[PDB]
Amino acid sequence: TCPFYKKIPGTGFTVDAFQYGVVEGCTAYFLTHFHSDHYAGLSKHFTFPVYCSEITGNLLKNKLHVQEQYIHPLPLDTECIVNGVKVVLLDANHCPGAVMILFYLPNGTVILHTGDFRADPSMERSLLADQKVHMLYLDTTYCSPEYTFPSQQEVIRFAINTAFEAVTLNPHALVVCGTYSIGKEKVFLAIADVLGSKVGMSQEKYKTLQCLNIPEINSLITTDMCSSLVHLLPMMQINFKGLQSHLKKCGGKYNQILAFRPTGWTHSNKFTRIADVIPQTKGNISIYGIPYSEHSSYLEMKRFVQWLKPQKIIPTVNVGTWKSRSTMEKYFREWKLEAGY
Ligand code: NI
Numbered sequence: 001t002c003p004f005y006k007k008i009p010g011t012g013f014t015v016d017a018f019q020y021g022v023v024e025g026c027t028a029y030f031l032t033h034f035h036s037d038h039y040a041g042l043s044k045h046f047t048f049p050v051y052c053s054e055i056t057g058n059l060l061k062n063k064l065h066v067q068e069q070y071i072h073p074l075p076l077d078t079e080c081i082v083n084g085v086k087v088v089l090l091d092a093n094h095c096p097g098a099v100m101i102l103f104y105l106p107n108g109t110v111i112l113h114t115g116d117f118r119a120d121p122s123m124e125r126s127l128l129a130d131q132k133v134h135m136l137y138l139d140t141t142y143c144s145p146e147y148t149f150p151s152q153q154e155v156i157r158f159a160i161n162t163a164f165e166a167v168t169l170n171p172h173a174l175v176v177c178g179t180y181s182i183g184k185e186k187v188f189l190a191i192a193d194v195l196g197s198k199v200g201m202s203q204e205k206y207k208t209l210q211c212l213n214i215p216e217i218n219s220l221i222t223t224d225m226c227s228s229l230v231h232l233l234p235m236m237q238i239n240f241k242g243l244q245s246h247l248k249k250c251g252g253k254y255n256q257i258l259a260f261r262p263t264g265w266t267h268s269n270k271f272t273r274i275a276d277v278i279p280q281t282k283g284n285i286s287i288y289g290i291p292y293s294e295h296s297s298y299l300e301m302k303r304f305v306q307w308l309k310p311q312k313i314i315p316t317v318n319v320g321t322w323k324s325r326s327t328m329e330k331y332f333r334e335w336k337l338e339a340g341y
Contacts, residue, residue: 005137005314008113010105012083015113015137018042027083028072032115033098034059035181042066051082053089055097058211059182077127090126092117094294095183096212102127112308113137114316119296119304128308136310140317141295143328147265148298149291150274156190158274159260159290163191166258167229173256175230176246178238182208183294184262189220191260192230200228226253235261240282247285256284262292302335309341 002020007013012027018041023029031052032038042050044065049072052060057073060066074080076089076099086104094116103111112133167173175195177188192199199221201209206223214220222228233246238261247257258279269291279286296304305313313332318324 005316005319008103008111010107010109011085011103013085013103015101016115018046022048030101030113031056031060032092032101032113033095034063035095035116035183038116039064046070051087053097053099055211055213056099058213059097059208062211063208088127090123090128093120093123094118095181096185096214097182102133109134111135111137112310114139116141116294117296118294119300121303123304124307133308134311135314136305136308136312137314137316138301138305139295140301140315140328142265142293142298143301143315143318143331145298146270149265149269149293152186152292154274155290155292156186158277159187159288160190160194162288163258164194166256167195170256172254173229173258174247174250174254176238176243176257176259177230177232178235178259178261179205179232180235182212184292185209185212185214187260187262187290187292188230188232192220192228195229197229198222198227199230199232200225201232205232226251229254238287240285240287243285243287257286259285259287261287261289263289264293264295265291302331305332306335306339306341309339 002017002023006015006017012025013030014023014026015030016032016038017023018039028049028051031050034056042064046066050070051072054073057071060071061068074089076091080087088102089099092098092100092115098115100115100117101113110131110133116139163175175191188199203223206221209221238259243257243259279288315328
């Protein structure tokens, strides 16, 4: 049964609620982004209206085979009427196709659902600037002050400089990057661009990438692994055994691997600056964990919420334990007392 924090009151709508069967009274199912915890339940057998971005809609049709007649893509930044209710989709600064949804309820209440997001000051000049929000359904993934990490731009600067140095010292080095979902494509695209290479990958990942409306993509990716010196592999294979095995397959073209694991936050962020990050190494194999986040840091989250001044906050992440819920509620009251709303 569908939990309360996935229902939008005063409407027929649910958000990211596909794993509960037929939800009583739901006339439209919104999907914020194509990540498995959120799409869980969609398939070619789904027969209700799904509302989403264009990019999310391309993934639904090609990857999950949802029929075209039930996919309702909406443009961003544009007022749309859905089943009698005004809605707007806004870029969430998460993975490709990810949105927040603004719902203008018939009774005058305004609700923002962030989906998954990485808050940014640029959001303070979207269509959110123009009016008050009563209720915020908030991505609280990293809602505690210990969660710190660098900007995405600093992380990519580290990755490009690391890769370019290594391959310039050794032209026979291969670069490998882990993946297990959409998102974080800048990691492997920025490294391939500095090296003058396309990114090589499986047919299933190439397919996924072809759904993302990235400009000039045919120029940047390939399924011909022998033509590329940046390869993508499943995240599970980014370890010494899995990389040894991959190197065997490359027909003696390479004698070294430098590999990247983009994670979210890890406890090494408590101690080590991005600049000082070092790899784990075994023989001719080195692995870097890099903290490329597509969720808000604590400080980014707090800035956004203190600017928005919502009347009520409903967390959408870390909701299963009393300790988590009580911690989150304490920070929300601090933020409110400090800013004066
Ligand atoms: Ni996500």
